[PDB]
Design a protein around this ligand. Sequence first.
Ligand SMILES: [Hg+2]
Ligand SMILES: [Hg+2]
Ligand SMILES: [Hg+2]
Ligand SMILES: [Hg+2]
Length: 260
Amino acid sequence: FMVSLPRMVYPQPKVLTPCRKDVLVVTPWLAPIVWEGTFNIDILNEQFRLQNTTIGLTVFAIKKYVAFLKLFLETAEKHFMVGHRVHYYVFTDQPAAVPRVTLGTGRQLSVLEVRERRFLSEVDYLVCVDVDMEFRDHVGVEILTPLFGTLHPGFYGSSREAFTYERRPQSQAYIPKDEGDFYYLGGFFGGSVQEVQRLTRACHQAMMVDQANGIEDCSHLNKYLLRHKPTKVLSPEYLWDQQLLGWPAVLRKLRFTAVP
Ligand SMILES: [Hg+2]
Ligand SMILES: [Hg+2]
Ligand SMILES: [Hg+2]
Ligand SMILES: [Hg+2]
């Protein structure tokens, strides 16, 4: 049951004006592709707050990568799901090195030491990101959906033959030259807990099969998302490297970026 939205005043959507003429904003399976100018965040925030949505954010910080946690968390506090309930899950081999970062209300952090079902009872969505990154602009409930992937910032303009998919037929991750929608990158993906756990289970099983066959890019992610199409795709706004790629006109905002 979803309750009624309150009265809200905002500009009328214009049926005979595209919001972007420079980029594709829907996939051929009718999933939105999330670019700045496609969404009204006020509408979406209402829809999500009325469901009291909790977002989990998972990050692996091992060895020297623990050093990126402070900036990662500070900037998430500024930009990630602000106004909603957030549970950060930091997987680390160095629990005592996790910095003590001050969090907004309704936001919590758990540290899990490394050498499942918990997520189902704790959060509605899971977002899995790399820790060596920083938020620079809004990353909010516009991304939330059963299953989403993000466009590789190095390849969004490329033809699919150029995508660095797995190309050896003996690999479970094999995608032929004539197949492929997009090249997704593993730095930023998510969905419902159920969907994200399906994805990671399928990648893990295919990885075991390849290792069994003596075969060792985000190639499994890409095979999964070819075969189980995401319900949203995020633009490279959500996973950028300004050092390597600059700031092209097609990017109106740079939301989540590499840290040198
Ligand atoms: Hg628009
Ligand atoms: Hg995850
Ligand atoms: Hg991840
Ligand atoms: Hg995967």
